[PDB]
Amino acid sequence: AFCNLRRCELSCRSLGLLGKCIGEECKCVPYN
Numbered sequence: 001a002f003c004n005l006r007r008c009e010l011s012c013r014s015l016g017l018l019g020k021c022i023g024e025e026c027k028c029v030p031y032n
Contacts, residue, residue: 004026011026
């Protein structure tokens with residue numbers, strides 16, 4: 001199964017975080 005990256009880079013952005021694909025799950029983290 002693939003991660004929902006386009007949903008993640010918006011949802012974490014609405015919190016001031018980088019949306020990161022772990023592999024099938026999303027993470028909200030500092031921008032690199």
